Design a binder for this molecule. Structure first.
Ligand code: HEM
Ligand SMILES: [C-]#N
Length: 153
């Protein structure tokens, strides 16, 4: 679990992200695919965006990216007790999309990299440590949840 000081670090940067969420989302999905091309294959709807350019141009990618971060910010806002918001995510990711935990850690690292790039003066060492720990808590709990649905991860 994180301490409240850590949580203050996390939610402080998150407040800086929200006014530009969509552009943050978009860049996370694109960087995901670029740096770990095998993840693209889990997405039937984006199967055909083979070039980088096309990805940059897709309205669907941007809206999917926004959806992703929107879910993530509700979970981070519940701090250590985020059961209820996490459950339905773990359910869809375990039974419908089937995404391994290794792919979850890949996106996590890319979220931290994107924010760091976009907030060079407010995302310092304490904050990146705290955000890394919040996302690690989210991956861990997703991984526990997954077992309740019959999925290994
Ligand atoms: C780690 C942060 C993640 C979050 C917060 C996130 C969140 C979401 C949300 C809110 C949705 C749509 C509603 C739902 O189906 O539950 C979703 C869709 C999906 N997620 Fe994720 N996701 C995460 C990571 C991943 C990863 C790493 C992958 C694949 C490598 C992935 C693949 C998908 C798929 C395939 C869909 C369906 C998209 C469609 O409608 O066609 N998710 N995700
Ligand atoms: C969501 N990927």
């Amino acid at each position: 679990g994180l301490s409240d000081d850590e949580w203050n670090h996390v939610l402080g940067i998150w407040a800086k992200v929200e006014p530009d969420l969509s552009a943050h989302g978009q860049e996370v999905i694109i960087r995901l695919f670029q740096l770990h091309p095998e993840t693209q294959e889990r997405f039937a709807k984006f199967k055909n965006l083979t070039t980088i350019d096309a990805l940059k141009s897709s309205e669907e990618v941007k809206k999917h990216g926004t959806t992703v971060l929107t879910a993530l910010g509700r979970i981070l806002k519940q701090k250590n007790n985020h059961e209820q918001e996490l459950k339905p995510l773990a359910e869809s990711h375990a039974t419908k999309h089937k995404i391994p935990v290794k792919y979850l850690e890949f996106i996590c690292e890319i979220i931290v990299k994107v924010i760091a790039e976009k907030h060079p003066s407010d995302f310092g060492a304490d904050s990146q440590a705290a955000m890394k720990k919040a996302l690690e808590l989210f991956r861990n709990d997703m991984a526990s949840k997954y077992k309740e649905f019959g999925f290994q991860g």
